[PDB]
Structures are given as structure tokens and as C-alpha cells.
Amino acid sequence: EQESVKEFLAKAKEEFLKKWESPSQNTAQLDHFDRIKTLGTGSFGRVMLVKHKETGNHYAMKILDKQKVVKLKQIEHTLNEKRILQAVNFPFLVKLEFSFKDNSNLYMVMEYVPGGEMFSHLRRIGRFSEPHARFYAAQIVLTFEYLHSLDLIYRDLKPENLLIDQQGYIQVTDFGFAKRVKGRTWTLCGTPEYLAPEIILSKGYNKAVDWWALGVLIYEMAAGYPPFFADQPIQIYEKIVSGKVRFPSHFSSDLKDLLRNLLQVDLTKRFGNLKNGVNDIKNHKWFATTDWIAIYQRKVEAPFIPKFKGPGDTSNFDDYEEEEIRVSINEKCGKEFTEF
């Protein structure tokens, strides 16, 4: 690789390690914000649109219930999420602006991206043309190049976690399964449709699982549906381990060739995990029209710009029951969350 790429990644790792070793803590509190709307929910928390009362700036506030985190065995994963987010910096990652806790909850306050999830736009239009899919895929290739050089694995790539911003570019959100890993790791986690074979077979696995998930994402963007699906997870898993995939006839020959090498069931033969690493992907014929520097600099005109009226518009997100943010008069689970 060119020395300019090597020096860029060496500086990125230096800046990450300084924040990783000395994390920020307790940088706002709940009554500094007004609550506006619930943007989405989940197994042990939700994300709310909020407005800061002194500056007027909008944020996306992720709220996790401490007792429920403990019951669903997610303590280590929650601590991973906040420690990684306060230490990274890259054009296509959401920015964490504040974090804090109280007697009942943990809070992560991020810059708000009003354009909505990629999932909504893909399901609305049906599928993306190959140039449109390729513009998004290039941003994910550069983001994984960055995260993997910091010894991080992301482990939750899927369309609902890719937000579309005011310039039509991607910002990746939700680091709940991200982890710093020197060699191998073992936890069963992810969404069934995106899991690599070595996770399903309970092996020790590495960053090659993120390149498998990139193959599932590019197939889904260009076809409109993922390659492996069924009503029961055990049926999805049998299809993933089989080593067979079927492609629509409208796919280009170059796209089919790239996807056979990302959706390779033998992890020692998979693109992204060979001696040349990410450069086997960047140099593939499907990416021949891509200007990697121009994408990083945000100089390429996007395929589309989401429709929205202002920085507080919620029209690209959907409607959920509005529930209280209740804070107990007694402290819960203080010991488990000391480092947060």
C-alpha cells in the first residue's frame, strides 16, 4: 500500500488508544434536555429525539435499563459500546457527544441524523441499482478498514443500522455488539440472516465475519431481499452452512464474482481475510469506477438526498407508544456499571 495510507492508519490507532486508555465519563445529565419523540425501540432500551435546553441542538439519546441489561446478560456488551464510541473518529460513524448514568438507566447522546435508516428507503424503492449499491458499499469497506486496524470487530452490519445523512452519505449506528479483539472471540450474537457459518458452528472467529456480512448486505441492496431467509432460524442456519447461493439474472457478472468470494464458507479463502487484506476487495473489477479518496473526502455527488424539513424533523422515522423515562429513588446495579 502507499505510505500515505499506512501513515493515516498509524495516526488513527494512536488517537484511538489515547481515548481508550482514559475514557470520558459523566458529561451531562437528564434534565439538561427536553424529550420530543421516540424514534425506535429494542430489547432493553429505546432511542429518543431530544433538544438541549441551553444550545437548542438536537440529539438521538439511547436509553438502556440497567436491571434489564443484567437479566439479558449484556453488561460486558454495554460497557464495550460506550468505551468504543467515545474513542473512535471517522467520517461514516455516528458521533457520541455526551454520556452519563443515574439510579435506573445508562445514556448515550449522539448527534441526530434526520434522513432515516437505509432499511426504510430500500424497502420503499424495492432495490438499488448497482452504482447506488456500490456508493454505499465503498463507505462500508473504508469504515471496516479503519475499525479492523484498531483491532475492533463490528458484528451487527444490516440495513437498519446504516443512517442516511443530509448529504446522502452513511453514518453507522449501534455498537452494542462491537468488541476489541486481538486474535479470536466466541460469543453467539448478531441477526440470523447476517451470521457467518463459523458463528453458527460455535467456533473461535475473527474479523472475517464482518466481510461475510458485507456480502449479505451488498446482495440485499442489489436484489431487494437477503440471500438466506426462512420462517425459523434453524432453517436459515442450514442454508448459510450449505455453500450454495442463487443470484438474480439481472446481476452483472462482476457482482456475482465479488459475492462468491465474500460469501465463501471457508473463512481462510474469504476476501478480506487473505494476505492482501482489504486490497483484494478495493481492486476487484466491481469497484473499477470507484474513486476511494473522493468518497472518503465526501466529494462524490450522492445517489439521493432524503426529504426532510429541518434538523428536528422526525418524518423519516415511524410511530411508537410513548412510555415514561422513570428514575427510581434507589440506586440499582451500581457495582456492575462502575466503569460507565
Ligand X SMILES: COc1ccc(-c2nnc([C@H]3CCNC3)o2)cc1
User: Strand, helix or coil at 276?
Assistant: coil
Residue 97: other Cβ atoms inside 10 A: 17
Q: Which stretch binds ligand X (CB under 6 A): 25-33, 106-114, 227-235, 257-265?
A: 106-114
- For cell 454495554, name the residue: 78
Which ranges constitute the DSSP H helices of the chain? 3-21, 66-71, 75-85, 118-125, 130-149, 197-200, 208-223, 233-241, 253-262, 279-282, 292-296
User: Is position 331 annotated in a ligand binding site?
Assistant: no
162 binding ligand X? (CB under 6 A): no
Query: Among positive and negative, which fits the CA dihedral 124, 125, 127, 131?
Result: negative
List the one residue from 48, 50, 60, 170 that touches ligand X (CB under 6 A): 60
Cα separation, 337 vs 68, in Å, equals: 13
Reduce the DSSP state of residue 2 to 3 states and report it.
coil
Contact flag: residue 199 with ligand X (CB under 6 A): no
Flag whether 180 is marked binding: no
Compute the Cα dihedral for 306, 308, 314, 319 and give only its sign.
negative
Decide if residue 47 touches ligand X (CB under 6 A): yes
Specify the residue, 164 or 236, whose C-beta has the smaller distance to ligand X: 164
Q: Which one among 173, 261, 264, 316 touches ligand X, defined by CB under 6 A?
A: 173
Applying CB under 6 A, the span of 97-105, 110-118, 209-217, 305-313 interacting with ligand X comes to 110-118
Binding pattern for the stretch 3-42 against ligand X, x by CB under 6 A and - elsewhere: ------------------------------------xxxx
Measured distance CA(126)–CA(113) in Å, rounded: 23
Residues touching ligand X, count (CB under 6 A)? 16
The label of the residue with cell 469506477 reads 289
Q: Name the catalytic one among 34, 65, 156, 210.
A: 156
Q: Is 331 in the site for ligand X (CB under 6 A)?
A: no
| Residue 12 identity (one-letter amino acid) | A
Residue 30 or 36 with smaller CB distance to ligand X: 36
User: Considering beta carbons, is residue 42 or 334 the nearer one to ligand X?
Assistant: 42
Nearer to ligand X, 192 or 277 (CB): 192
Please tell me whether 131 is known to bind a ligand.
no
Residue 76 or 291 with smaller CB distance to ligand X: 76
Say how many C-beta atoms besides its own lie within 10 A of residue 162's C-beta. Answer: 23
Is 40 known as a binding-site position? yes
Query: How many Cα atoms are found within 13 Å in the side-chain-facing hemisphere of 23?
Result: 20
Cα separation of 306 and 201, whole Å?
Answer: 40
Is residue 156 part of the annotated active site? The answer reads yes
State in angstroms the smallest separation of the CB of 28 from ligand X.
Answer: 16
Identity of the residue, 63 or 263, whose beta carbon is nearer to ligand X in the bound complex: 63
CA distance 142 to 91: 10
Beta bridge partners of 117: 163
Binding flag, residue 187, ligand X (CB under 6 A):
yes
How many residues comprise the chain? Answer: 340
Binding residue ranges: 39-47, 62, 111-117, 158-161
Query: Which residues contact ligand X (rule: CB under 6 A)?
Result: 39-42, 47, 60, 76, 94, 110-113, 160, 163, 173, 187
Binding residue ranges for ATP: 39-47, 62, 111-117, 158-161
Which residues are annotated as catalytic?
Answer: 156
